[PDB]
Symmetry: D2
Subunit: 114 residues, 4 copies
Amino acid sequence: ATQGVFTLPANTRFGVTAFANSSGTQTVNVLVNNETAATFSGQSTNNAVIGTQVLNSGSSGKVQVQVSVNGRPSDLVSAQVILTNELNFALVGSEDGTDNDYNDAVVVINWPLG
Amino acid sequence: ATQGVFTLPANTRFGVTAFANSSGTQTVNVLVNNETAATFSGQSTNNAVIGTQVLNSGSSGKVQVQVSVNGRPSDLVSAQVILTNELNFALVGSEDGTDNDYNDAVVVINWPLG
Amino acid sequence: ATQGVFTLPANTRFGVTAFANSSGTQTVNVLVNNETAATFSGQSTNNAVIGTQVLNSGSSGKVQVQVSVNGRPSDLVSAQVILTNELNFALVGSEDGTDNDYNDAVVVINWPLG
Amino acid sequence: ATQGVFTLPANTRFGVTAFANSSGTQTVNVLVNNETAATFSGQSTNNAVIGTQVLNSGSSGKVQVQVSVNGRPSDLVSAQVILTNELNFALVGSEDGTDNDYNDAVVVINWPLG
Ligand SMILES: CO[C@@H]1OC[C@@H](O)[C@@H](O)[C@@H]1O
Ligand SMILES: CO[C@@H]1OC[C@@H](O)[C@@H](O)[C@@H]1O
Ligand SMILES: CO[C@@H]1OC[C@@H](O)[C@@H](O)[C@@H]1O
Ligand SMILES: CO[C@@H]1OC[C@@H](O)[C@@H](O)[C@@H]1O
Ligand SMILES: [Ca+2]
Ligand SMILES: [Ca+2]
Ligand SMILES: [Ca+2]
Ligand SMILES: [Ca+2]
Ligand SMILES: [Ca+2]
Ligand SMILES: [Ca+2]
Ligand SMILES: [Ca+2]
Ligand SMILES: [Ca+2]
């Protein structure tokens, strides 16, 4: 199944933050309406924040996270969880290798903000 | 029900990261085995990452998040999510006021690292 | 925080199923737009299905689960999780006693159907 | 990533319940320690509970859900969610066709019981 794809309400500000846990240099691209709206990169085996930004979901509400290491797309896992019918988390894990820890780049999307 | 309390595997590194979305200054306390192990504070209505840290879950694995605003404890909501039976997120929202957006301080705990 | 309340898409069929894990008979009420849409009653300490029904979210999309034992409201815990940006679960646990297992009545709401 | 595989605590009672939402007859197999422990079959486009059962995770704690339709394995999507650090749900959706609703068989595992 498709992973790392989320539908947000239109024209909604959302946070996106990425962490790295790998010997591979992570590139995290955040697409809004199928167009790259943010790009983060970095390398850490200690969960370093490699990027954080506030974006707007725009007219489509279409948000997609992609992760690559050396030009190769990582395998993604994702889900959305909603707390008290108000607070949204869109969560993404990724695997760049053979150990199946899925933490190589970890991406957290949250909304609403403010 | 108790919120913001999580049983992690014992003696395991985890990331804890806090975001602010309130006019009130947030103070986030992270307890490991009932002792403060980290404290983050800031004020933002735009999802500022007021703190991020790697901690060890210790002998019990008990991790507790508490949030206060001008010395008043915020109301918490929480859940844990596991993807592909490997990637763990413990999630906390908090409310310091009356609008019930529960984003006033948002705390994300993630493991495993490395 | 409020628990057991969910905003579904309008005019959408959803499944509701309730399980019992308590020595006391559980009364589960499902409200749609603040009015009774279904009520389940049964007793099991072995996860018996005490009710299952297809309902419609109607014009409000507001669905609320309440649980009581002997007319005394149980303490609720809930969340919504969305898989592959398509499949929705609204989950409820309840506690009627002192052991905090929160399984005394467990309610699972799923959509879309068909 | 592997889906539909969950590690439960050893020797834990759990419920497993399967719902159908497809023109195709669903076959759901539940394995414990790599051996079939429950099987359900049925066709519904109205979220019928095609089966529910209580099992024990045994010494391994390894529980796997498989879904097939007329001999072909469905594509699975899964996650686990824990409420109030106590109440567990392991969630499975599956897709047997082209519309990607992932509801064709839905499987919910819950613990603790009792
Ligand atoms: C060579 O493997 C990569 O770096 C070290 C670990 O973080 C692994 O999970 C990762 O896939
Ligand atoms: C005065 O209210 C506080 O600041 C503005 C908003 O962020 C509110 O959600 C928050 O509770
Ligand atoms: C009297 O206690 C009730 O019945 C037995 C157990 O299922 C308990 O969890 C429940 O609260
Ligand atoms: C022919 O398609 C199958 O039956 C009707 C719908 O339930 C579809 O989701 C399912 O994949
Ligand atoms: Ca890896
Ligand atoms: Ca890694
Ligand atoms: Ca607020
Ligand atoms: Ca706020
Ligand atoms: Ca109980
Ligand atoms: Ca119980
Ligand atoms: Ca389908
Ligand atoms: Ca279907």
